[PDB]
Amino acid sequence: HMKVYLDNNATTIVDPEVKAAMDPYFTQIYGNPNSLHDFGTECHPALRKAMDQMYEAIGARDEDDIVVTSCATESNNWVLKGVYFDLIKNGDKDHIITTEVEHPSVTATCRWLEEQGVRVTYLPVNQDGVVEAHTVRDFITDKTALVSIMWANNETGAIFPVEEISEICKEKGVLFHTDGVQAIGKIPVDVIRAGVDFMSFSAHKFHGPKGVGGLYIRNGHPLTSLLHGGEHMGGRRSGTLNVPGIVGMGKAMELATYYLKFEEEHVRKLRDKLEDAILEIPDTYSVGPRENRTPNTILVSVRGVEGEAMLWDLNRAGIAASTGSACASEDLEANPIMVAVGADSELAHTAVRLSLSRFTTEEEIDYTIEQFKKAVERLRSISSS
Amino acid sequence: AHMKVYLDNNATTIVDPEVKAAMDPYFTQIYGNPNSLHDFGTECHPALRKAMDQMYEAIGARDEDDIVVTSCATESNNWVLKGVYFDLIKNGDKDHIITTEVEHPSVTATCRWLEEQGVRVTYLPVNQDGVVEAHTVRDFITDKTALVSIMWANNETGAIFPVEEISEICKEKGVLFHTDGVQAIGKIPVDVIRAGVDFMSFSAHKFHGPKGVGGLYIRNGHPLTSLLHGGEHMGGRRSGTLNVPGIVGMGKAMELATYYLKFEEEHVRKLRDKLEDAILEIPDTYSVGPRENRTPNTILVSVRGVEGEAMLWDLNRAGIAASTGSACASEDLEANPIMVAVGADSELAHTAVRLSLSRFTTEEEIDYTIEQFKKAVERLRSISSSYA
């Protein structure tokens, strides 16, 4: 029996060196950075180094702004509700474009905004689990305020063509926000090559602590504060700084870009080994093309078995994984495949999501393969066909 | 001379080594998402349950009430103000909020933005004793008042507001009552039912908890439109992955704060009174606010000849951390010169030195601060051409 964590898309372990970087800023270094005395300013070089690491990690420039939030949920709420306030309730706009596969912090916010008179089109997702740039350009009107498309999906790992969406969005002169939580540490992130106006991210996705996130803004574009008050974060988000959170997030983001620049094959090779091994089981289908998928993600549908049952038989074996919505369909060759769908569909079935990280060992993978085979055989023997 | 001494506790506090020890496992040892169904995710569930229990017991909340964990009391204040505006003003029949001129910027600036959306706001001035009394709030409530938001205790003077009577008046008039209780936890007894409040904001890093975590208490699970929408974290009232270390730390810190409350009432109050008496032995010095209505750990002293910012800077050169506080010159009923609390945006305001202790303050630190304070006053009065 071995405990194995493959739910990294939900949360990640804090790198011990990141935790060590955070350690002094609880009891040793505790002053408020907004104070003028030496106790308050003692953490200022650490905050500056952290902010520099974040700017460097995402390819932001000096002109741009990076506001530290409590989580990417805050960031999504902030950009959606602030653009609604700026260009819809006090502007001449009334439309937002997004996808039916976004994180709940975007979907539920969009539904509340629709409860405030905003027209929102949740764009359906194509066979590859992606939304393409021509659909969105066909859906931009003269009243569209904002296009909000996640950078990569958390259930399938599919990468969205955020750059092409940016080109079109700039053509129509509409702001572009992306939920980039799944991008940091897994794919190259250059927010000027992506052309996005706003980007949300979360530290606990790339081995930073929980309780700290960020929102990126291009060229300090105006965005009404979600949290008003004091002049923390350039007067854009009030409240005492989560000093350990900031220090840790910066260290984690630097480490994420280092391990993507060199440790890129270790995670990708283990993901592909696991996926090949699982796909050698009869009547298994992996959702989404691997060549457009983050290196750490598999979303597998097992026929005969149900995703929750597969999840709990894995959990009994010490393996943590999660669920993902999928729909039954075919390709152009008329071969049955499993494809992405919004969770709120009736044609969705639960597939098993397995997400690795840079801390996954090959032994963990051998154990996971063996236990996956075991669970599949035991459970197909007890149900349906 | 130089000794580092921290007397700016009303701004932020050191994390109790026990709170840090309670937090340590929940970064790398226990890291699963509490919203997951596998054992990795649920492993932290008992710590969250225990922390939530610690909070409810610490503030005297009941089982019906809700305690939603926020990122900071700034979040809580923004949430309560903007949510009541959404519920009872934009989609209701109210348009008035009553508050004070001495609120934290989290509430003042929010109120000004609400005024920018058509909300009538009355910033009630604060009296000589540095407090707003219940009868004036009653005089200002109409049948359009949606919410009364008055801080529990002031962060510059430490003056305690009569939140119980204000609640009584609010309940007679049937208007919701929110308090910024950040300054109350660890310094005064906090029972949110005896205070009669409908909403209360608090922040962990004020009572020796970590930065990045706060809370909002809600009576009886009163409806309040979410500031952060999404998943159903915190009963669907505040989305976003739980700050597990922050929650555990906040629970431990709140338990410690209520335990140490009598240490703070006795010993810390004794050290505060020593420092304040010693400082008041200097000619032309005035303590803002009556002590018999003040949190045990706070002094706001106005010096006549010296300027507050200069006094802060050379005190810091001596290793002493303190802060500023707004004050206005006045007289008492006997026509004796006194310094009284005033909003920061007044032009009749000058800077007084704020000194705030904690349960970690030593009598050596107090003695050193007394000596260095006297030195700085003498030094800066010795350079004045005006002072006499």
Side-chain angles (χ1 to χ4, degrees), chain B residues 247-261:
Chain B
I247 293 166
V248 172
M250 187 173 218
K252 182 61 166 170
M254 233 173 310
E255 182 191 272
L256 284 176
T258 68
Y259 171 81
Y260 275 95
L261 179 121

Side-chain angles (χ1 to χ4, degrees), chain A residues 135-255:
Chain A
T135 318
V136 52
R137 166 240 174 246
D138 290 355
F139 273 83
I140 299 174
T141 85
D142 263 12
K143 306 265 273 191
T144 314
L146 165 71
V147 168
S148 185
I149 296 181
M150 80 205 317
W151 203 322
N153 177 253
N154 60 320
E155 286 177 4
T156 75
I159 310 158
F160 284 69
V162 172
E163 176 165 18
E164 312 194 359
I165 304 170
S166 75
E167 304 177 314
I168 81 157
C169 276
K170 295 166 174 165
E171 188 276 322
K172 250 55 205 300
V174 74
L175 299 190
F176 183 24
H177 161 255
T178 188
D179 186 325
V181 170
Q182 293 292 328
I184 310 278
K186 324 177 146 112
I187 65 176
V189 178
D190 190 329
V191 289
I192 312 296
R193 172 188 330 257
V196 290
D197 296 285
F198 305 98
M199 170 194 172
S200 303
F201 54 91
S202 266
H204 73 98
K205 268 333 141 43
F206 43 96
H207 303 290
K210 297 171 181 72
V212 61
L215 172 65
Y216 159 87
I217 315 184
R218 190 191 223 273
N219 281 100
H221 191 287
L223 186 60
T224 293
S225 282
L226 179 64
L227 305 184
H228 290 87
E231 304 263 308
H232 306 78
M233 284 287 134
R236 305 201 80 156
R237 201 265 196 184
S238 181
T240 307
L241 296 193
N242 176 2
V243 182
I246 292 165
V247 168
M249 180 170 214
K251 180 61 168 173
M253 227 167 186
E254 179 184 271
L255 284 172

Side-chain angles (χ1 to χ4, degrees), chain A residues 27 30 77 81 210 226 228, chain B residues 15 31 78 82 211 227:
Chain A
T27 296
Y30 56 96
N77 274 256
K81 297 190 188 177
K210 297 171 181 72
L226 179 64
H228 290 87
Chain B
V15 178
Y31 57 95
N78 276 258
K82 298 185 196 175
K211 293 170 176 74
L227 174 66

Side-chain angles (χ1 to χ4, degrees), chain A residues 124-136:
Chain A
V125 86
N126 63 16
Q127 211 80 186
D128 294 332
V130 86
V131 176
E132 296 280 14
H134 56 90
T135 318
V136 52

Side-chain angles (χ1 to χ4, degrees), chain B residues 161-236:
Chain B
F161 283 74
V163 171
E164 181 159 15
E165 315 181 347
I166 303 165
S167 76
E168 295 169 316
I169 277 74
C170 284
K171 292 162 175 315
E172 293 183 349
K173 253 56 212 301
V175 49
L176 298 83
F177 185 23
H178 163 261
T179 185
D180 192 330
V182 172
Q183 291 297 325
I185 305 266
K187 305 119 151 160
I188 63 178
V190 177
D191 187 333
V192 298
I193 299 158
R194 168 192 257 107
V197 297
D198 299 287
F199 302 94
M200 181 208 172
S201 291
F202 53 87
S203 190
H205 80 97
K206 272 333 140 44
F207 48 89
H208 305 290
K211 293 170 176 74
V213 65
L216 178 69
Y217 158 86
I218 314 182
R219 204 178 222 268
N220 275 111
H222 195 98
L224 183 67
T225 293
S226 279
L227 174 66
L228 299 191
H229 289 94
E232 306 262 306
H233 305 69
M234 283 283 133

Side-chain angles (χ1 to χ4, degrees), chain B residues 52 55-56 59 61 65-69 202 215-218 234:
Chain B
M52 227 60 54
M55 302 185 203
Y56 274 74
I59 72 184
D65 307 321
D66 269 10
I67 299 196
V68 182
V69 170
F202 53 87
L216 178 69
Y217 158 86
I218 314 182
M234 283 283 133

Side-chain angles (χ1 to χ4, degrees), chain A residues 9 28 58 61 113 120 123 128 160 164 190 192 201 222-223 255 267 269 283 302 350 385:
Chain A
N9 285 7
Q28 313 177 11
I58 62 172
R61 298 168 310 171
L113 291 180
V120 188
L123 272 186
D128 294 332
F160 284 69
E164 312 194 359
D190 190 329
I192 312 296
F201 54 91
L223 186 60
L255 284 172
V267 172
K269 83 165 283 296
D283 286 358
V302 197
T350 62
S385 41

